[PDB]
Design a protein around this ligand. Sequence first.
Ligand SMILES: CC(C)N1CCC[C@H]1C(=O)N1CCC(n2cnc3cnc4[nH]ccc4c32)CC1
Ligand SMILES: CC(C)N1CCC[C@H]1C(=O)N1CCC(n2cnc3cnc4[nH]ccc4c32)CC1
Lengths: 294, 280
Amino acid sequence: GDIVSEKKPATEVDPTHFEKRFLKRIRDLGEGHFGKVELCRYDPEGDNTGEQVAVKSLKNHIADLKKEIEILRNLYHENIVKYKGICTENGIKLIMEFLPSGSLKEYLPKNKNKINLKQQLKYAVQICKGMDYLGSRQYVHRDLAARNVLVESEHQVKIGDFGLTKAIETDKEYYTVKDDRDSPVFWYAPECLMQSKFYIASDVWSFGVTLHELLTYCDSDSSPMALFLKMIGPTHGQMTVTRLVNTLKEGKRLPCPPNCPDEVYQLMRKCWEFQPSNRTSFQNLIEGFEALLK
Amino acid sequence: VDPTHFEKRFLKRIRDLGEGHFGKVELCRYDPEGDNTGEQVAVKSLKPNHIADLKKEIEILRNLYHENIVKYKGICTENGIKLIMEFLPSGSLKEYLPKNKNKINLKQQLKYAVQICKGMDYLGSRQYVHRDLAARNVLVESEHQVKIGDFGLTKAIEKEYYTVKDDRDSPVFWYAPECLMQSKFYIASDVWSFGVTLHELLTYCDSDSSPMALFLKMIGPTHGQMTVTRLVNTLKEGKRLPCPPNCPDEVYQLMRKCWEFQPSNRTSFQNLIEGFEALL
Ligand SMILES: CC(C)N1CCC[C@H]1C(=O)N1CCC(n2cnc3cnc4[nH]ccc4c32)CC1
Ligand SMILES: CC(C)N1CCC[C@H]1C(=O)N1CCC(n2cnc3cnc4[nH]ccc4c32)CC1
């Protein structure tokens, strides 16, 4: 008889599946731990009219990127960056919505005239809401910093990278850190630096530092790293972290940002109690800021 | 004629003997007759700022007189200065022990331990903290005699301790918890470093059993900037270097007395001398 062929079934289109051949690289948006994010135009018509997207690719760690994809795919919150889809090659890429204003680290220095204290406190509430949503799903972020917070508009921010995000086991209080060589130490709580234990309260400490960055408009000369290095000394090399732990044990903290009212600084100080159990919660911070806003 | 004054024009560089913190030591022949018959000497000069530190080390060594402390011979003045010491051809215990295992038994290792303790006790009695006691800094005078051979980090105690400022190149795996956590160096901190030096001696300075290799296996070797806090956490938990192979429990128990978490609970050098002498 004639040569046989397979009956072709109805070919359905998945809007979350992005073809590699149409993902056209524009520029880098940031280097993460296992991956890197690039601005791409997904252009299936090949005429430079396609939608712009943020694409996360591996820089070995495919299992970690797959885990980050599955976390983000299932988060639905207005202050959390939107998952758009994937690009499958065993390799995989994470496709997200692109926010042209970029991160608060890039946005704030260029927009000081436009952003007053009231707008800074609204961003602080939005970061707390996104973080509380994450905590309620039993996740620890581990990388909350202004460079990871994106600007949706002048009125809206979104948490924008989940490269270090880990699930806390049910009925347990923290995640035990193994990979720590590239830890953002100047945003880390003492229990993270001393025992490699990450709690939801550890994310609250990182929020306090993120709030300090927002209030200083992310100026590089007032950055948490620049300020802590001036306090402890910048020539300690491998001894930097123990000197940082010793300074924190002594009760020393980042100073009140210029023009920051004491009532805002007092909420910031509640994020920095030495013991995780004595720290404020994200829900208590939302109430505190809302009271200062109205 | 000053016999402690060495003319630069007569010092012939031969080879390097070791790199320190602010300086480096070189083997030289001091040859004023220009016929290669001159005496061989160890010369410490600054690494090409820190002249004040080298001058301080020279003045410390010049005034130490002990059979288990390397002999000061003199200086070479240019502001510049070089430290002249006697040369020990057998070099350090780090170089000597791996090549002489057959010749050095437990009894000889315990005699070296007594000698290191005596030299260290002499230093402590002059109110100095060494801060760099390790097998690589102990020289072999002969099969029967060792001498502490570098004083690059040696500081006078005013008070019970010296507060450390320059610490980026700290030999962390030889350091007591108070040094790692608070940058405070006591005489008891030198006792902790001696315990680690004793472990090196007992393992014949083999690189695969070195205090760094053993601690890195315990804590993990991929922690980068987090290594020291992971080391502090392991020490806080009560974890210590294991008993060297073939080391009797009675020797290991003396070693463990150097490693009490609190400096005040640690053995003294005088108590270690008595302990080893009893075993000998
Ligand atoms: C994770 C940390 C270690 N790195 C340090 C440099 C910025 C940060 C990063 O890699 N990102 C990913 C890209 C982000 N980004 C910047 N502009 C963006 C615009 N749109 C975006 N959509 C998803 C991410 C994203 C954007 C900033 C945070
Ligand atoms: C101080 C530490 C950080 N360094 C790491 C390498 C060895 C050590 C050193 O610089 N020295 C100085 C030279 C010493 N040395 C080696 N053979 C020697 C032979 N004779 C010597 N007389 C005085 C020192 C000396 C000798 C060993 C320790």
